[PDB]
Coordinates of C-alpha atoms and ligand atoms in Angstrom, one line a residue:
Chain F
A1 CA 105.2 -69.8 143.7
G2 CA 103.5 -66.9 141.9
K3 CA 99.9 -67.9 141.7
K4 CA 97.3 -65.4 140.5
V5 CA 93.7 -65.4 141.8
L6 CA 90.6 -63.6 140.5
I7 CA 87.6 -63.5 142.8
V8 CA 84.3 -62.7 141.1
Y9 CA 82.1 -61.5 143.9
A10 CA 78.4 -60.9 143.8
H11 CA 76.9 -59.5 146.9
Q12 CA 75.4 -56.0 147.6
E13 CA 76.5 -55.8 151.3
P14 CA 80.2 -55.6 152.5
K15 CA 79.1 -56.8 155.9
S16 CA 77.4 -59.9 154.6
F17 CA 78.4 -63.5 155.1
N18 CA 79.4 -63.5 151.4
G19 CA 81.5 -60.4 152.0
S20 CA 83.2 -62.1 154.9
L21 CA 84.0 -65.2 152.8
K22 CA 85.4 -62.9 150.1
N23 CA 87.6 -61.0 152.6
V24 CA 88.9 -64.2 154.2
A25 CA 89.9 -65.4 150.7
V26 CA 91.6 -62.0 149.9
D27 CA 93.5 -62.0 153.3
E28 CA 94.6 -65.7 153.3
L29 CA 95.6 -65.8 149.6
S30 CA 97.4 -62.5 150.1
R31 CA 99.2 -63.8 153.2
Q32 CA 100.4 -66.8 151.1
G33 CA 102.0 -64.3 148.6
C34 CA 99.4 -64.9 145.9
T35 CA 98.5 -62.2 143.4
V36 CA 94.8 -61.3 144.1
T37 CA 92.2 -59.4 142.2
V38 CA 88.5 -58.9 143.0
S39 CA 85.7 -58.1 140.6
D40 CA 83.1 -56.6 142.9
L41 CA 80.2 -56.8 140.4
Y42 CA 77.6 -54.7 142.3
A43 CA 80.1 -52.0 143.2
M44 CA 81.1 -51.8 139.6
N45 CA 77.4 -51.6 138.5
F46 CA 78.4 -54.4 136.2
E47 CA 76.2 -54.6 133.1
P48 CA 74.4 -57.9 133.0
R49 CA 72.5 -57.5 129.7
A50 CA 73.8 -59.0 126.4
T51 CA 73.2 -56.2 123.9
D52 CA 74.6 -54.7 120.8
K53 CA 76.4 -52.1 123.0
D54 CA 78.9 -54.9 123.7
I55 CA 80.4 -54.4 120.3
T56 CA 82.1 -51.1 119.3
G57 CA 82.2 -49.9 115.7
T58 CA 80.3 -51.7 112.9
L59 CA 78.7 -55.1 113.1
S60 CA 79.3 -58.2 110.9
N61 CA 75.6 -58.4 110.1
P62 CA 73.6 -55.3 111.2
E63 CA 70.4 -56.7 109.6
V64 CA 69.9 -59.6 112.0
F65 CA 71.7 -59.1 115.3
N66 CA 73.0 -62.4 116.7
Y67 CA 74.8 -61.7 120.0
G68 CA 76.9 -64.9 120.0
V69 CA 78.1 -64.4 116.5
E70 CA 78.7 -60.7 116.9
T71 CA 80.7 -61.0 120.0
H72 CA 82.8 -63.9 118.5
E73 CA 83.6 -61.6 115.6
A74 CA 84.2 -58.6 117.9
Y75 CA 86.6 -60.6 120.0
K76 CA 88.6 -61.6 116.9
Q77 CA 88.6 -58.0 115.7
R78 CA 89.4 -56.5 119.1
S79 CA 86.2 -54.4 119.2
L80 CA 84.5 -55.7 122.4
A81 CA 83.3 -53.1 125.0
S82 CA 85.9 -52.3 127.6
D83 CA 84.0 -53.6 130.6
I84 CA 84.1 -57.0 128.9
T85 CA 87.8 -57.0 127.9
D86 CA 88.7 -55.7 131.3
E87 CA 87.3 -58.8 132.8
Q88 CA 88.8 -61.1 130.2
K89 CA 92.2 -59.7 131.0
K90 CA 91.7 -60.6 134.7
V91 CA 90.6 -64.1 133.7
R92 CA 93.4 -64.6 131.2
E93 CA 96.0 -63.7 133.9
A94 CA 94.4 -65.8 136.6
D95 CA 95.5 -69.4 137.6
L96 CA 92.3 -69.7 139.7
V97 CA 88.9 -68.1 139.5
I98 CA 86.8 -68.1 142.7
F99 CA 83.1 -67.2 142.3
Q100 CA 81.6 -65.9 145.6
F101 CA 77.8 -65.6 145.7
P102 CA 74.5 -66.3 147.4
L103 CA 72.3 -68.9 145.7
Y104 CA 69.5 -67.2 143.7
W105 CA 66.9 -69.6 142.3
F106 CA 69.2 -72.6 142.3
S107 CA 71.8 -70.5 140.4
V108 CA 73.9 -67.3 140.3
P109 CA 72.5 -63.9 140.9
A110 CA 71.6 -62.2 137.6
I111 CA 74.5 -59.7 137.8
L112 CA 77.0 -62.7 138.0
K113 CA 75.0 -64.6 135.3
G114 CA 75.6 -61.5 133.1
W115 CA 79.3 -61.7 133.8
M116 CA 79.3 -65.3 132.6
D117 CA 77.2 -64.5 129.5
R118 CA 79.2 -61.4 128.4
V119 CA 82.8 -62.3 129.5
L120 CA 83.0 -65.9 128.4
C121 CA 82.4 -65.3 124.7
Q122 CA 83.3 -67.5 121.8
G123 CA 87.0 -67.1 120.8
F124 CA 87.9 -66.2 124.4
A125 CA 86.5 -69.0 126.6
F126 CA 85.7 -71.6 124.0
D127 CA 85.6 -72.2 120.3
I128 CA 85.0 -74.8 117.5
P129 CA 87.0 -76.6 118.3
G130 CA 87.9 -76.2 122.0
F131 CA 85.3 -76.9 124.6
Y132 CA 84.9 -79.2 127.6
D133 CA 88.4 -80.7 128.2
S134 CA 89.8 -78.6 125.3
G135 CA 88.0 -75.4 126.2
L136 CA 90.2 -72.3 125.8
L137 CA 90.6 -71.7 129.6
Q138 CA 92.2 -75.1 130.1
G139 CA 95.0 -75.1 132.7
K140 CA 92.9 -72.8 134.9
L141 CA 91.1 -73.7 138.0
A142 CA 87.6 -72.6 139.0
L143 CA 85.8 -72.8 142.3
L144 CA 82.2 -72.0 143.3
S145 CA 81.8 -70.6 146.8
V146 CA 78.1 -70.5 147.3
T147 CA 75.9 -69.6 150.3
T148 CA 72.3 -70.9 150.6
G149 CA 69.1 -70.1 152.4
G150 CA 68.3 -73.8 152.7
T151 CA 70.0 -76.1 155.2
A152 CA 72.2 -79.1 154.3
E153 CA 69.3 -81.3 155.3
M154 CA 66.9 -79.6 152.8
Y155 CA 69.4 -80.3 150.1
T156 CA 69.3 -84.1 150.0
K157 CA 68.6 -86.4 147.0
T158 CA 65.1 -87.3 148.4
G159 CA 64.6 -83.9 150.0
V160 CA 62.2 -81.2 148.7
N161 CA 65.2 -79.3 147.1
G162 CA 67.1 -82.3 145.8
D163 CA 70.9 -82.8 146.2
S164 CA 72.9 -79.5 146.0
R165 CA 74.9 -81.2 143.2
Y166 CA 71.8 -81.1 141.1
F167 CA 71.9 -77.3 140.8
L168 CA 75.6 -77.2 140.4
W169 CA 75.4 -78.9 136.9
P170 CA 74.7 -75.8 134.7
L171 CA 77.4 -73.9 136.5
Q172 CA 80.2 -76.4 136.9
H173 CA 79.6 -78.5 133.8
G174 CA 77.6 -76.4 131.4
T175 CA 79.7 -73.3 131.9
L176 CA 83.0 -73.8 133.7
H177 CA 83.9 -77.3 132.4
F178 CA 82.6 -76.2 128.9
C179 CA 85.2 -73.4 128.9
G180 CA 88.0 -75.8 129.8
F181 CA 88.3 -75.0 133.5
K182 CA 89.2 -77.7 135.9
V183 CA 86.6 -77.5 138.6
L184 CA 87.6 -77.6 142.3
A185 CA 85.1 -79.0 144.8
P186 CA 82.5 -76.4 145.5
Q187 CA 82.5 -74.6 148.8
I188 CA 79.0 -74.7 150.1
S189 CA 78.2 -72.7 153.2
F190 CA 74.7 -73.8 154.1
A191 CA 72.2 -71.5 155.7
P192 CA 74.3 -68.8 157.4
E193 CA 71.1 -66.8 158.1
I194 CA 69.7 -69.6 160.2
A195 CA 73.0 -70.7 161.8
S196 CA 74.2 -69.7 165.2
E197 CA 77.2 -67.4 165.6
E198 CA 79.4 -70.4 166.5
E199 CA 78.2 -72.3 163.4
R200 CA 78.8 -69.2 161.2
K201 CA 82.4 -68.8 162.5
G202 CA 82.9 -72.5 161.9
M203 CA 81.9 -72.1 158.3
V204 CA 84.2 -69.1 157.8
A205 CA 87.0 -71.1 159.4
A206 CA 86.4 -74.1 157.2
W207 CA 86.8 -71.8 154.2
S208 CA 90.0 -70.1 155.5
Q209 CA 91.4 -73.6 156.4
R210 CA 90.6 -74.9 153.0
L211 CA 92.3 -72.0 151.4
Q212 CA 95.6 -72.9 153.1
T213 CA 96.0 -76.0 150.9
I214 CA 94.0 -75.0 147.8
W215 CA 97.0 -75.4 145.5
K216 CA 97.3 -79.0 146.6
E217 CA 93.8 -79.9 145.5
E218 CA 92.7 -82.3 142.8
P219 CA 89.8 -81.2 140.6
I220 CA 86.5 -83.2 140.7
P221 CA 85.6 -85.4 137.8
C222 CA 83.1 -82.9 136.3
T223 CA 80.7 -85.6 135.0
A224 CA 77.0 -86.4 135.0
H225 CA 77.9 -89.3 137.4
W226 CA 79.5 -86.9 139.9
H227 CA 76.4 -84.7 139.7
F228 CA 73.5 -87.2 139.6
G229 CA 75.0 -90.7 140.0
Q230 CA 75.8 -92.9 142.9
Chain D
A1 CA 35.9 -68.0 130.8
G2 CA 38.7 -67.2 128.4
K3 CA 42.4 -67.6 129.2
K4 CA 45.1 -65.0 129.9
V5 CA 48.7 -65.6 128.8
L6 CA 51.9 -63.8 129.7
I7 CA 54.9 -64.3 127.4
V8 CA 58.2 -63.3 129.0
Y9 CA 60.5 -62.9 126.0
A10 CA 64.3 -62.5 126.1
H11 CA 65.8 -61.9 122.8
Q12 CA 67.4 -58.8 121.3
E13 CA 66.4 -59.3 117.7
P14 CA 62.8 -59.3 116.4
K15 CA 63.8 -61.2 113.3
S16 CA 65.5 -64.0 115.3
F17 CA 64.3 -67.6 115.6
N18 CA 63.2 -66.7 119.2
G19 CA 61.3 -63.7 117.8
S20 CA 59.4 -66.0 115.3
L21 CA 58.5 -68.4 118.1
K22 CA 57.3 -65.5 120.2
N23 CA 55.3 -64.1 117.3
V24 CA 53.7 -67.4 116.4
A25 CA 52.7 -67.8 120.0
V26 CA 51.0 -64.4 119.9
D27 CA 49.4 -65.2 116.6
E28 CA 48.0 -68.5 117.6
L29 CA 46.9 -67.6 121.2
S30 CA 45.3 -64.4 119.8
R31 CA 43.5 -66.5 117.2
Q32 CA 42.1 -68.7 119.9
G33 CA 40.6 -65.6 121.6
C34 CA 43.1 -65.7 124.5
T35 CA 44.2 -62.5 126.2
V36 CA 47.9 -62.1 125.5
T37 CA 50.6 -59.9 127.0
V38 CA 54.3 -59.9 126.1
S39 CA 57.1 -58.7 128.4
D40 CA 59.9 -57.8 125.9
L41 CA 62.7 -57.6 128.4
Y42 CA 65.4 -56.2 126.1
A43 CA 63.1 -53.7 124.5
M44 CA 62.1 -52.6 128.0
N45 CA 65.8 -52.3 129.1
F46 CA 64.6 -54.5 132.0
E47 CA 66.8 -54.1 135.1
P48 CA 68.4 -57.4 136.0
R49 CA 70.4 -56.4 139.1
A50 CA 69.1 -57.0 142.6
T51 CA 69.9 -53.7 144.3
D52 CA 68.7 -51.4 147.1
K53 CA 67.1 -49.3 144.4
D54 CA 64.4 -52.0 144.3
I55 CA 63.1 -50.6 147.6
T56 CA 61.9 -47.0 147.9
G57 CA 60.7 -46.9 151.5
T58 CA 62.4 -46.9 154.9
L59 CA 64.7 -49.9 155.0
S60 CA 64.1 -52.4 157.8
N61 CA 67.8 -52.4 158.5
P62 CA 69.6 -49.4 156.7
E63 CA 73.0 -50.3 158.1
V64 CA 73.2 -53.9 156.7
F65 CA 71.3 -54.5 153.4
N66 CA 69.6 -57.9 153.0
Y67 CA 68.0 -57.9 149.6
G68 CA 65.5 -60.7 150.4
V69 CA 64.4 -59.3 153.8
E70 CA 64.0 -55.8 152.4
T71 CA 62.1 -56.8 149.3
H72 CA 59.8 -59.0 151.3
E73 CA 59.0 -56.1 153.6
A74 CA 58.8 -53.7 150.7
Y75 CA 56.3 -56.0 149.0
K76 CA 54.1 -56.0 152.1
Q77 CA 54.3 -52.3 152.4
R78 CA 54.0 -51.6 148.7
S79 CA 57.3 -49.8 148.4
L80 CA 58.9 -51.9 145.7
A81 CA 60.2 -50.3 142.5
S82 CA 57.3 -50.0 140.0
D83 CA 59.1 -52.0 137.3
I84 CA 58.8 -55.0 139.7
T85 CA 55.1 -54.5 140.6
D86 CA 54.3 -53.9 136.9
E87 CA 55.6 -57.4 136.2
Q88 CA 53.8 -58.8 139.2
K89 CA 50.5 -57.5 137.9
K90 CA 51.0 -59.4 134.6
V91 CA 51.9 -62.6 136.4
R92 CA 49.0 -62.3 138.9
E93 CA 46.5 -61.9 136.0
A94 CA 48.0 -64.7 133.9
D95 CA 46.7 -68.3 133.7
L96 CA 49.7 -69.4 131.8
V97 CA 53.2 -67.9 131.7
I98 CA 55.4 -68.8 128.7
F99 CA 59.2 -68.0 128.9
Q100 CA 60.7 -67.6 125.4
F101 CA 64.5 -67.6 125.4
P102 CA 67.8 -68.9 123.9
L103 CA 69.8 -71.1 126.3
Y104 CA 72.7 -69.2 127.8
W105 CA 75.1 -71.4 129.7
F106 CA 72.5 -74.1 130.4
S107 CA 70.2 -71.4 131.8
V108 CA 68.2 -68.3 131.0
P109 CA 69.9 -65.1 129.7
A110 CA 70.9 -62.8 132.5
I111 CA 68.2 -60.2 131.7
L112 CA 65.6 -63.0 132.3
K113 CA 67.4 -64.3 135.3
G114 CA 67.0 -60.8 136.8
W115 CA 63.3 -60.9 136.1
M116 CA 63.1 -64.1 138.1
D117 CA 65.3 -62.7 140.9
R118 CA 63.5 -59.4 141.3
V119 CA 59.9 -60.2 140.3
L120 CA 59.4 -63.5 142.2
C121 CA 59.9 -62.0 145.7
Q122 CA 58.8 -63.3 149.0
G123 CA 55.2 -62.4 149.8
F124 CA 54.3 -62.3 146.1
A125 CA 55.5 -65.6 144.7
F126 CA 56.1 -67.7 147.8
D127 CA 56.0 -67.4 151.6
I128 CA 57.7 -69.3 154.4
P129 CA 55.8 -71.5 154.8
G130 CA 54.0 -71.5 151.4
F131 CA 56.2 -72.9 148.7
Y132 CA 56.5 -75.8 146.2
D133 CA 52.9 -77.2 146.1
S134 CA 51.8 -74.5 148.5
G135 CA 53.6 -71.7 146.5
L136 CA 51.6 -68.5 146.1
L137 CA 51.3 -68.8 142.3
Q138 CA 49.4 -72.1 142.6
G139 CA 46.6 -72.5 140.1
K140 CA 48.9 -71.1 137.3
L141 CA 50.8 -72.8 134.5
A142 CA 54.3 -72.1 133.3
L143 CA 56.1 -73.3 130.2
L144 CA 59.7 -72.9 129.0
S145 CA 60.2 -72.5 125.3
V146 CA 63.9 -72.8 124.8
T147 CA 66.2 -72.7 121.8
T148 CA 69.8 -74.1 121.8
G149 CA 73.1 -74.0 119.9
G150 CA 73.7 -77.6 120.8
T151 CA 72.1 -80.5 119.0
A152 CA 69.4 -82.8 120.3
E153 CA 72.1 -85.6 120.3
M154 CA 74.5 -83.6 122.4
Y155 CA 71.6 -83.2 124.9
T156 CA 71.1 -86.9 125.7
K157 CA 72.2 -89.0 128.6
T158 CA 75.2 -90.3 126.7
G159 CA 75.8 -87.0 124.9
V160 CA 78.5 -84.6 126.0
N161 CA 75.9 -82.1 127.4
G162 CA 73.9 -84.7 129.3
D163 CA 70.1 -85.0 129.0
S164 CA 68.2 -81.7 128.3
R165 CA 66.1 -82.4 131.4
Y166 CA 69.1 -82.0 133.6
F167 CA 69.5 -78.3 133.0
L168 CA 65.8 -77.7 133.4
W169 CA 66.0 -78.5 137.1
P170 CA 66.9 -75.1 138.5
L171 CA 64.2 -73.4 136.3
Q172 CA 61.3 -75.8 136.5
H173 CA 61.8 -77.1 140.0
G174 CA 64.0 -74.6 141.8
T175 CA 62.1 -71.6 140.6
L176 CA 58.7 -72.2 139.0
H177 CA 57.5 -75.2 141.1
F178 CA 58.9 -73.5 144.2
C179 CA 56.6 -70.6 143.5
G180 CA 53.6 -72.9 143.1
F181 CA 53.4 -73.2 139.3
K182 CA 52.4 -76.4 137.6
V183 CA 54.8 -76.9 134.8
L184 CA 53.9 -77.8 131.2
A185 CA 56.4 -79.9 129.3
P186 CA 59.2 -77.8 127.9
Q187 CA 59.3 -76.8 124.2
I188 CA 62.9 -77.2 123.2
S189 CA 63.8 -76.1 119.7
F190 CA 67.2 -77.6 119.1
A191 CA 70.0 -76.0 117.0
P192 CA 68.1 -73.7 114.7
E193 CA 71.3 -72.0 113.6
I194 CA 72.7 -75.3 112.3
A195 CA 69.3 -76.5 110.8
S196 CA 68.1 -75.8 107.3
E197 CA 65.5 -73.2 106.3
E198 CA 62.9 -76.0 106.1
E199 CA 63.8 -77.6 109.4
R200 CA 63.6 -74.1 111.0
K201 CA 60.2 -73.6 109.4
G202 CA 59.1 -77.0 110.7
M203 CA 60.2 -76.2 114.3
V204 CA 58.2 -73.0 114.3
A205 CA 55.2 -74.8 112.9
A206 CA 55.4 -77.6 115.5
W207 CA 55.3 -75.0 118.3
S208 CA 52.3 -73.2 116.7
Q209 CA 50.6 -76.6 116.3
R210 CA 51.2 -77.6 119.9
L211 CA 49.7 -74.3 121.0
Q212 CA 46.4 -75.2 119.4
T213 CA 45.8 -77.8 122.1
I214 CA 47.9 -76.3 124.9
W215 CA 44.9 -75.9 127.2
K216 CA 44.3 -79.6 127.0
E217 CA 47.7 -80.5 128.4
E218 CA 48.5 -81.9 131.8
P219 CA 51.5 -80.6 133.7
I220 CA 54.6 -82.8 134.3
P221 CA 55.4 -84.4 137.6
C222 CA 58.1 -81.8 138.5
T223 CA 60.2 -84.2 140.5
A224 CA 63.8 -85.4 140.7
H225 CA 62.7 -88.6 139.0
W226 CA 61.2 -86.7 136.0
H227 CA 64.4 -84.7 135.6
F228 CA 67.1 -87.3 136.4
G229 CA 65.6 -90.8 136.1
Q230 CA 66.0 -93.6 138.6
Ligands
FAD1 C1 66.4 -63.5 144.8 C2 66.8 -64.6 145.8 C3 66.8 -65.9 145.4 C4 67.2 -66.9 146.3 N1 67.1 -68.2 146.0 C5 67.5 -69.2 146.8 C6 67.5 -70.5 146.4 O1 67.2 -70.9 145.3 N2 67.9 -71.5 147.4 C7 68.3 -71.2 148.6 O2 68.6 -72.1 149.4 N3 68.3 -69.9 149.0 C8 67.9 -68.9 148.1 N4 68.0 -67.6 148.5 C9 68.4 -67.2 149.9 C10 69.9 -66.8 149.7 O3 70.7 -67.8 149.1 C11 70.5 -66.5 151.1 O4 69.8 -65.5 151.7 C12 72.0 -66.1 151.1 O5 72.8 -67.2 150.6 C13 72.5 -65.7 152.5 O6 73.9 -65.3 152.3 P1 74.2 -63.8 152.8 O7 75.7 -63.5 152.5 O8 73.3 -62.8 152.2 O9 74.0 -63.9 154.4 P2 73.9 -62.7 155.5 O10 72.5 -62.4 155.8 O11 74.8 -61.6 155.1 O12 74.7 -63.5 156.7 C14 74.0 -64.3 157.7 C15 74.5 -63.8 159.0 O13 75.9 -64.0 159.1 C16 76.5 -62.8 159.7 N5 78.0 -62.8 159.4 C17 78.6 -62.1 158.4 N6 79.9 -62.2 158.4 C18 80.1 -63.1 159.4 C19 81.3 -63.6 160.0 N7 82.5 -63.3 159.5 N8 81.2 -64.4 161.1 C20 80.0 -64.7 161.6 N9 78.8 -64.2 161.2 C21 78.9 -63.4 160.1 C22 75.7 -61.7 159.1 O14 75.8 -60.5 159.9 C23 74.3 -62.3 159.2 O15 73.8 -62.1 160.4 C24 67.6 -66.6 147.6 C25 67.6 -65.2 148.0 C26 67.2 -64.2 147.1 C27 67.3 -62.8 147.5
FAD2 C1 76.2 -66.2 125.9 C2 75.7 -67.4 125.2 C3 75.6 -68.6 125.9 C4 75.1 -69.8 125.2 N1 75.1 -71.0 125.9 C5 74.6 -72.1 125.3 C6 74.5 -73.3 126.0 O1 74.9 -73.4 127.2 N2 74.1 -74.3 125.3 C7 73.6 -74.3 124.0 O2 73.2 -75.3 123.4 N3 73.7 -73.1 123.3 C8 74.2 -72.0 124.0 N4 74.2 -70.8 123.3 C9 73.7 -70.8 121.9 C10 72.3 -70.2 121.8 O3 71.4 -70.9 122.6 C11 71.8 -70.1 120.4 O4 72.7 -69.3 119.7 C12 70.4 -69.6 120.3 O5 69.5 -70.6 120.9 C13 70.0 -69.5 118.9 O6 68.6 -69.0 118.8 P1 68.3 -67.6 118.0 O7 66.9 -67.2 118.2 O8 69.3 -66.6 118.4 O9 68.7 -68.0 116.5 P2 68.8 -67.2 115.2 O10 70.3 -66.9 114.9 O11 68.1 -65.9 115.4 O12 68.1 -68.2 114.2 C14 68.8 -68.9 113.2 C15 68.2 -68.5 111.9 O13 66.8 -68.7 111.9 C16 66.2 -67.7 111.1 N5 64.8 -67.6 111.2 C17 64.1 -66.7 112.0 N6 62.8 -66.9 111.9 C18 62.6 -67.9 111.1 C19 61.5 -68.6 110.6 N7 60.2 -68.3 111.1 N8 61.6 -69.7 109.8 C20 62.9 -70.0 109.4 N9 64.0 -69.5 109.8 C21 63.8 -68.4 110.7 C22 67.0 -66.5 111.4 O14 67.0 -65.5 110.4 C23 68.3 -67.0 111.6 O15 69.1 -66.8 110.5 C24 74.7 -69.7 123.9 C25 74.8 -68.4 123.2 C26 75.2 -67.3 123.9 C27 75.3 -66.0 123.2
ET3 C1 76.5 -68.3 118.9 C2 77.8 -69.0 119.1 N1 77.8 -69.7 120.4 C3 77.5 -71.1 120.5 C4 77.1 -71.8 119.2 C5 75.9 -71.7 118.6 C6 75.6 -72.4 117.4 C7 76.6 -73.2 116.9 C8 77.9 -73.3 117.5 C9 78.1 -72.6 118.6 C10 77.5 -71.7 121.7 C11 77.1 -73.1 121.8 C12 77.1 -73.7 123.1 N2 76.8 -75.1 123.1 C13 77.5 -73.1 124.2 C14 77.8 -71.7 124.2 C15 77.8 -71.0 122.9 C16 78.2 -69.6 122.8 C17 78.5 -68.9 124.0 C18 78.9 -67.6 123.9 C19 78.9 -66.9 122.6 N3 79.2 -65.6 122.6 C20 78.5 -67.6 121.5 C21 78.2 -69.0 121.6
ET4 C1 63.3 -67.3 152.0 C2 64.7 -67.7 151.3 N1 64.5 -68.4 150.1 C3 64.6 -69.8 150.1 C4 64.8 -70.6 151.3 C5 65.8 -70.7 152.2 C6 65.7 -71.5 153.3 C7 64.6 -72.2 153.6 C8 63.5 -72.1 152.7 C9 63.6 -71.3 151.6 C10 64.5 -70.5 148.8 C11 64.5 -71.9 148.8 C12 64.4 -72.6 147.6 N2 64.5 -74.0 147.6 C13 64.2 -71.9 146.4 C14 64.1 -70.5 146.4 C15 64.3 -69.8 147.6 C16 64.2 -68.4 147.7 C17 64.0 -67.6 146.5 C18 63.9 -66.3 146.5 C19 64.0 -65.6 147.7 N3 63.9 -64.1 147.6 C20 64.2 -66.3 148.9 C21 64.3 -67.7 148.9
ET5 C1 78.8 -81.4 117.4 C2 77.5 -80.6 117.2 N1 77.7 -79.7 116.0 C3 78.0 -78.4 116.2 C4 78.1 -77.7 117.5 C5 77.1 -76.9 118.0 C6 77.2 -76.3 119.2 C7 78.3 -76.6 120.0 C8 79.3 -77.4 119.6 C9 79.2 -78.0 118.3 C10 78.1 -77.5 115.0 C11 78.4 -76.2 115.2 C12 78.6 -75.4 114.1 N2 78.9 -74.0 114.3 C13 78.4 -75.9 112.8 C14 78.1 -77.2 112.6 C15 78.0 -78.1 113.7 C16 77.6 -79.5 113.6 C17 77.5 -80.0 112.3 C18 77.2 -81.4 112.2 C19 77.0 -82.2 113.3 N3 76.7 -83.6 113.1 C20 77.2 -81.6 114.6 C21 77.5 -80.3 114.7
ZN6 ZN1 81.8 -81.4 133.5
ZN7 ZN1 59.5 -79.7 140.9

């Protein structure tokens, strides 16, 4: 009992398929008695740019600004901007982080990329040492819930788009695994725009049904073999 | 017939290693007699977020906002935000587009991701049909000039990050090839922060040197096999 979930949500439109997937997650996890928080990035006008405004007070080397170094140092000295530390608190408290987003150029929308760039700073999400299996968010679960324009068929190994697992690598391995997350199997809702109403409802139902047993899941082996291998 | 180059540059600090790579590109291409334009995204405070502010005309569906549909229609009608069409002019006139950036989470910094999201809209960069080899930017070249924190060794098949080509897939194939670009081989400058002053100087020089004969290069086969092997 007592699980905490953060949903990081990146869609402009409440009535969208993404919005529906987010709301189903909120309702079902809430029904289960979980603690639920939603970071609605567009509604928050979330800042995507990594800039020197992300550090308050004086820099550790204001002659040559290195964002990575400066945010590492600011994290240690508790002088990060409040929009960042607000998100870090939600992540720190969460047992599971769900990312809900439409696929933009085989990746996350820029507003969500900005969340990953700015929130997951050195000292908070990883360090030397402490990355991949020993990343600082170890013990936490992460799950990518992505919607696509392309159909399942268009996303095969030999297809024009390649296997969907190919585009997952930078997100699941390079970002989430790197920070110590155990990665649950992605939820891929293929081509809702093209799908019939029945097919759309079926995809929503699949998600809702999955959420009923999400705490019983095993994480994937987040390896190059899982992503590219046979 | 001389050549036109656009450099889309994503770093906050002029004195950075990325800044030096951008400046030597400008120096060398200028020396050759090329026409050179730089989009300095951080200096321009470039807007990364995909929002309804990107359309200024009457929305096709003002009760349910679909970013892709609305920007496609706005492109055709000429009612996109002018920061978008300003970038589109630079791309349209370019023979070669160089992207200069530090790797953020196996990808581009969010401010540059936003450039891709917002600038490469339907009708301008691709059509349905009219993508990959029939993409609308066919005839143009693109090149990623990337810097990393991780070492070359970490970015190998047996290294913990996997091969560097793995993370290039969403950018080179999912984005640039999809829009019709032919893709020149990536320039990856590994681990400058860790390297010595001389090694750093050497990496900048190697870039400058490659650029001398850039117009003689052939593009890569931007395929799953090139990226992932057999
Ligand atoms: C900049 C950009 C880059 C992109 N890059 C890619 C890419 O690389 N690869 C790719 O494949 N695609 C890409 N796309 C397409 C994009 O991924 C899809 O448009 C997106 O995933 C669709 O999801 P949505 O929530 O916006 O769908 P919506 O348009 O909101 O939903 C589809 C339909 O489902 C309906 N619906 C909503 N809720 C429910 C419900 N509860 N039950 C039943 N029906 C419901 C909606 O009303 C709508 O009619 C890109 C799009 C953009 C704008
Ligand atoms: C949010 C975030 C995510 C990241 N994700 C990843 C990731 O997934 N994978 C990864 O590998 N790395 C990652 N990194 C690390 C990042 O890619 C590196 O920090 C970046 O590439 C370093 O390049 P730079 O231009 O900032 O280096 P700088 O710090 O600017 O350069 C190093 C030194 O070179 C010096 N220099 C400048 N010009 C010259 C010159 N001409 N000759 C000699 N020396 C010169 C500078 O003064 C500086 O001291 C991430 C960093 C951040 C902040
Ligand atoms: C700039 C520090 N730094 C490094 C890094 C760079 C050089 C040497 C050691 C670590 C880094 C290296 C990898 N692979 C992945 C992510 C990051 C990173 C991420 C965020 C941040 N805020 C600083 C970060
Ligand atoms: C038009 C939607 N759409 C699709 C897409 C979805 C289904 C079928 C064909 C293409 C797409 C497919 C791939 N592989 C790569 C990028 C995009 C894309 C990119 C931007 C955008 N604004 C719309 C996009
Ligand atoms: C193991 C690679 N690696 C990293 C490193 C860089 C990015 C992410 C993780 C580690 C490193 C990071 C810092 N700050 C300082 C020295 C080293 C280093 C030094 C020697 C070596 N042989 C590998 C090294
Ligand atoms: Zn992994
Ligand atoms: Zn390709």
